[PDB]
Paper text:
Interestingly, the type I-D system utilizes subunits that are homologs of type I complexes, type III complexes, or both. The type I-D operon contains the type I signature gene cas3 split into its two domains; the helicase domain (Cas3′) encoded from a stand-alone gene, and the HD nuclease domain (Cas3″), which is fused to the large subunit as part of the core effector complex. The Cas10d subunit is bigger than other type I large subunits (Cas8) and similar to type III large subunits, yet retains the type I functionality of discerning PAMs in target DNA sequences. As is typical for Cascade complexes, a repeating, helical backbone of Cas7d subunits assembles around the crRNA, while the C-terminus of Cas10d and two Cas11d subunits constitute a minor filament along the belly of the complex.
To obtain mechanistic insight into dsDNA targeting, we employed cryo-electron microscopy to directly visualize type I-D Cascade bound to dsDNA with a protospacer sequence complementary to the crRNA and flanked by a GTT PAM. We employed focused 3D classification to overcome local conformational heterogeneity, which yielded a structure of the dsDNA-bound type I-D Cascade at a global resolution of 2.9 Å and enabled de novo atomic modeling of the entire complex. The stoichiometry of the complex was Cas10d1:Cas7d7:Cas5d1:Cas11d2, highlighting the addition of one Cas7d subunit compared to our recent sub-nanometer structure. We resolved 43 bases of the crRNA scaffold in the Cascade-dsDNA complex, as well as 16 bases of the target strand (TS) and 13 bases (five of which we modeled as poly-T) of the non-target strand (NTS). The unwinding of the dsDNA duplex occurs between a cleft created by the bottom Cas7 subunit and the spur on Cas10d, which we assign as the PAM-recognition domain (PRD). At the DNA duplex PAM site, we observe a loop from Cas10d wedged into the minor groove of the PAM duplex. One glycine (G433) interacts with the G (−3 position) in the NTS of the PAM, providing an anchor for the loop to lock into the minor groove. The K326 residue in Cas10d recognizes the C (−3 position) on the TS, the T (−2 position) on the NTS, and the G (−3 position) on the NTS via hydrogen bonding. In comparison to the ssRNA target-bound complex, the dsDNA-bound complex undergoes a continuous 5 Å shift of the small subunits away from the belly of the complex and slightly downwards towards Cas10d, along with a similar shift of Cas10d downwards.
Residue numbers in the entry:
A (entry chain K), D (entry chain J): 1 to 146
B (entry chain D), E (entry chain C), F (entry chain B): 1 to 320
C (entry chain I): 760 to 975
The structure:
DNA sequence: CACGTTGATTTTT
DNA sequence: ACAACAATCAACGTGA
């Protein structure tokens, strides 16, 4: 089971470490999938004229740029600990970078065959995967005591 | 120009085709961000980039088949209604409902673009398309845009909760080019002026017509032949070779390169070619068709004759 | 003789060299009496039997079956099979209907048994095939549907009576026609598909001729 | 296992545990077997390399992001006032995940041998029998409950 | 090139075949979304992946049996009409109705592709063909596309309520390959140019030809022989094994692999082989056949003499 | 191999059986949708699934008697015409009409496969053949395909009325395998090369050859014998039991399983076995026979000798 | 024992 | 549309 059971965690569980919209707000599908949306866009929008690690580091550059528009209630790595900005921002940036190691070297590189067309006809479907996975984890974490 | 070509066509629509094809070879350039979708994503396919050079695998957008025939077709029906040859009111004898039991079996739309009902019968289209492919790769020919849907209050909240009406949509960029060949089987001169009229006079394509999808169809050639020429894809692949894999070049340059590729390819097809209208002769033909469609009496005459020809076809060979 | 002179004959040439082929078919399986009546209709280029032919060829099937348990069971089954779908479907023979229109539910039952993988259960076939019968019936015109056309009773009870009438017919096809008679084997059903269909058309016309008399 | 046959009654009862409409409303065939229609679409559409649980999370979300697009009259879990609304969902998405495992394991895997060509040829029958089983159970239930 | 092969053909159609088979080995490459169907789904079957090394089972698409003889046949009939050898008008002395009693029983289609209805008898096809299989697996070779039919108002709900006509269809992807061996039994040289004409000149296959289903026939060899060579499935399986299952390869390299598999398989067949036109000899053959079909004065003579030969066969050995 | 095998055969054809059977053990694998019919459906029969273990009943397809001898017979006749040893023109002294008066009564077909029409007697087939059975059940081994026939206008109507030309036919799936033993009595060595030639050189079998029914004959053994070995059904029931009914195995494993069950069964037959050509000796012999059928001089000589042998049998013991 | 020879019937709505 | 088969299976007379 492991090789894609761990992906059915990591596809949301590796972004839950830096991004969590509270599901009780009943927020949009777009608002929950925001990390993955901007990873799959980085992965569809360029040819292999630069490395998989260059795709990881530039894509990390997108999410750390985009999430400065979201309100700080979305970012558990800022909410849930009390430490200096330039160090929590480094913890944020490297948590974003490891999430894109899943997105580039396992989700794109293995599961989407490593070919952008086979991702593109699936992007709504692997989005609906993350949509269910985020709720499957978070609503258990909130409500399992009932 | 057109005065000479009247001799190439049938004098009335034949029972069965007799190899009098006319092929329209055109580049369809995007304006205003089109959407070509079926299952909620832009249609794309993995493809070979070129023919001889440029052997690498490449994802390219596809304008899937009906999405280029039916905008043309409906713009034709609109002109038939405007000239008063057909009607939309259910009390009229010359009504033509688009797709249903109430559809006509004798107007130019029905006999050229085809129809099926069941009871009355059916008629195979005389205009032949195929799905058309982006000359460029998909990665460099698309962008996805967010849309939101607030209240008139200028907000996403009405009771202090959010309404959550936000999503994104995948759009084709402007100046993305789809090479296409449209083909017509055993038409009359008037049937030719009708379908060519549609190609030139139709501007909006794909989803969200009301907001997007304007396209600049540059006709590159017209070729009269005993049979079928190359696919849309073979023209796209031959053109990516001649474009050297470096598609970031002007629209006029891309049009003249397509005329040179079309003529290089036509010489490799096992079909006779009665005429090949390209270059200055096509700009002369296009201008003589633009004169027809701007002149009210002449357009009414030509397209009126077509109605008679299609009524004759219907009463002699068609669904009676 | 009156069955051999209907089929395996020509109008000036009785072909009595084929009477051994006509008898062996009648004895092997009694529904061949209706397969031969259909061949005679084909030669005579006539699209339907006369009212006389519908009781003649049936009294012949009842005569040649008279001593045999499996033939009397198959001839009783082919009547029961049609008498069951005639509870929920009735094309009126006066309108000159096709052999296909008469056999709409039986053709959609047999195609279901033959098209599904051999692994699937009888109690799955009964549900998938009754779905296809419901789907087909709802595409015909309302006058052909005895339970739904009768406005006298509440709509959910017309739906409930239709669903259980479709279920009992489909249960007879899958249990008794396929499971018991055809040994639960699709090869043995495929050989019989043609003579089951011919026997059901003659059964439908007989049940209709009997109804239009006894309704007085 | 013996689940290689006789599935449809278990398949429909598993979604009747979370989605319903009464035949007194006289609804369209497409609306009754909506849960199964999203399941068969997910199975047939995504790449053939992907494993059972990855099909399940995707298929579960692919119908959850569609059943909430219509009236709560059709959702016999979220309407139960006996439970707090955030815990109604904890029952609901675990009901979806068990319906979705029986279609990926019993239906696709066992009954169609895991071959997409076999499932695609028989899709309309696998639909029509679940539509009929749904009507059969719904118009039975109203008899015994009175 | 063709000047040397005229020696190998029969001088007129023989009564019984005398073992002079011409085989056309070709790859039918998908260009745009064909629909190969019977019973409402893409026809698909399980096969061994390849002959000796890759021995796992693999579901592959099937271009079922007629689906590659009818487009060829009908492109041939349309040329006979275009040259005026046959006619569609029910009053003419040279009428040939397709699929009917009024078949000519003496034109080239009738003699080469056969006929069956009526008192004048039947004739077996001299073109031999078999169902053809995708080189790749079905799961990697198809996609299903949904389609709808709005009212011309641009809505789905003209009655105030929906049409509910939304459905989907399964389509074979572009660049999917079907290996094929067409065969021709005891023809004349003009019969060879007619059948090779059809295979090279026909372009549309499967359902929805007026909208979809263009293909690219790459002839990879012509093999003159004393008998039947390999089945389409055996060419498919040998070629899959030769590529090791890594089928994501350029179109030309797939044609060069097919040519080098076919020559190694022919060396294992118990047939004397009079000629084996491959590579540069096939490039130089096909350009010479193109320059028949591109020239009116040559084509009308050749297909004209075929009329005579076939009319003669009809009046000496055939239907009279 | 051929240099030793030569000793086992008789030096000329006898009038009476002198023992000396040669048994050709084959698997006939379907390659392209065979139709094996009489009375309008695929021929099938109920059988025990296998000899000892799996003793339940099962319906299996029947490749009925002549469906596996007329292909062989006719393929040998077109070779005799190709080599010029027989002719199809009336008024030639070496005419051989198939199944009529005007059968030669001297050619290898007439002697090896027999004749019975008209004056000059009747001759028993020296090739003994039997009906073959599918190794698997009917249910796993067939499919029904709809076929239709529109007007050439591309629709099922010519005057608004329907054609309704729609029907099903059943075809055997690819990779369906038919185990069989062909047997040859009292041959000369050249007669063995002719019959074995037919078995390796034929490739179409069923109905609709022109479109369908290619098969791959893998010869799995050749057994020289004092009398009849097992039936086709018995080899089938042994092979199903040895696989346990697990029939989804590749053709190489299936041909190797047939080889070991045939040798197990042969050691239980009351038959002196002079030679038992299997495996590495058989794939030697099959190549030494391919070397005959690919060589114009060797084949003409051998089959010409046969003609003399069969013409001398005819003048000495046969039709005079 | 082994050579040689060559005509006839009347019809199945 | 269209075929249901196709052939062959003595009866003497005359001389040695």
């Amino acid at each position: 089971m492991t090789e894609k059971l761990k992906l059915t965690k990591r596809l949301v569980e590796e972004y839950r470490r830096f991004y969590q919209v509270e599901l009780s707000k009943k927020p949009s599908t777009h608002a929950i999938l925001l990390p993955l949306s901007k990873a799959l866009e980085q992965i569809l929008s360029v040819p292999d004229d630069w490395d998989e690690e260059e795709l990881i580091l530039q894509g990390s550059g997108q999410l750390q740029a985009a999430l400065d528009r979201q309100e700080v209630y979305t970012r558990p790595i800022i909410k849930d600990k009390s430490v200096a900005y330039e160090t929590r921002q480094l913890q944020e940036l490297e948590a974003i970078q490891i999430f894109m190691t899943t997105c580039v070297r396992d989700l794109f590189g293995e599961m989407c065959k490593g070919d952008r067309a086979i991702l593109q006809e699936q992007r709504n479907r692997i989005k609906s995967g993350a949509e269910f996975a985020y709720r499957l984890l978070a609503l258990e974490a909130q409500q399992n005591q009932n | 120009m057109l005065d000479s070509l009247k001799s190439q066509f049938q004098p009335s629509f034949p029972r069965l085709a007799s190899g009098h094809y006319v092929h329209f070879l055109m580049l369809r350039h995007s304006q205003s961000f089109p959407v070509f979708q079926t299952d909620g994503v832009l249609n794309t396919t993995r493809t070979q980039a070129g023919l001889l050079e440029k052997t690498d695998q490449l994802s390219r957008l596809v304008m899937f088949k009906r999405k280029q025939t039916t905008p043309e077709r409906l713009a034709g029906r609109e002109l038939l209604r405007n000239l008063g040859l057909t009607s939309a009111d259910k009390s009229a004898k010359n009504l033509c409902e688009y797709n249903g039991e109430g559809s006509c079996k004798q107007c130019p739309d029905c006999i050229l673009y085809g129809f099926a009902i069941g009871d009355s019968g059916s008629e195979r289209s005389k205009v032949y398309s195929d799905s058309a492919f982006s000359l460029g790769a998909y990665e460099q020919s698309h962008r996805s845009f967010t849309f939101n849907a607030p209240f008139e209050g200028g907000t996403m909240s009405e009771a202090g909760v959010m309404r959550s009406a936000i999503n994104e949509l995948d759009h084709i960029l402007p100046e993305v080019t789809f090479p296409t060949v449209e083909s017509l089987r055993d038409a009359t001169y008037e049937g030719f002026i009708y379908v060519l009229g549609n190609l030139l006079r139709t501007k909006r394509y794909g989803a969200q017509e009301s907001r997007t999808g304007t396209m600049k169809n540059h006709l590159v050639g017209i070729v009269f032949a005993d049979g079928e020429i190359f696919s849309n894809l073979h023209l796209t692949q031959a053109l990516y070779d001649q474009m050297g894999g470096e598609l970031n070049k002007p629209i006029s340059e891309l049009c003249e390169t397509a005329a040179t590729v079309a003529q290089d390819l036509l010489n490799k097809e096992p079909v006779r070619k009665s005429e090949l209208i390209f270059g200055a002769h096509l700009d002369t033909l296009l201008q003589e068709v633009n004169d027809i469609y701007q002149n009210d009496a002449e357009l009414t005459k030509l397209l009126g004759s077509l109605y008679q020809q299609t009524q004759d076809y219907a009463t002699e060979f068609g669904a009676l | 003789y009156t069955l051999h002179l209907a089929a395996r004959s020509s109008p000036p040439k009785a072909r009595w060299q084929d009477l051994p082929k006509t008898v062996q078919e009648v004895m092997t399986d009694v529904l061949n009496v209706f397969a031969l009546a259909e061949q005679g209709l084909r030669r005579e280029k006539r699209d339907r039997p006369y009212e006389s032919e519908v009781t003649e060829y049936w009294q012949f099937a009842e005569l040649f079956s008279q001593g045999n348990i499996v033939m009397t069971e198959k001839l009783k089954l082919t009547k029961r099979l049609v008498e069951e779908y005639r509870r929920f479907y009735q094309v009126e023979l006066s309108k000159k209907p096709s052999t296909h229109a008469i056999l709409l539910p039986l053709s959609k039952a047999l195609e279901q048994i033959l098209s599904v993988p051999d692994d699937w259960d009888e109690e799955e076939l009964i549900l998938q095939g009754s779905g296809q019968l419901q789907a087909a019936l709802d595409r015909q015109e309302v006058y052909t549907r005895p339970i739904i056309k009768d406005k006298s009773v509440a709509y959910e009870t017309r739906q409930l009576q239709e669903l259980e009438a479709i279920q009992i017919f489909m249960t007879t096809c899958v249990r008794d026609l396929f499971g018991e008679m055809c040994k639960g084997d699709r090869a043995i059903l495929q050989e019989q598909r043609n003579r089951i269909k011919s026997g059901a058309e003659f059964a439908y016309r007989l049940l209709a001729l009997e109804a239009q008399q006894n309704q007085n």
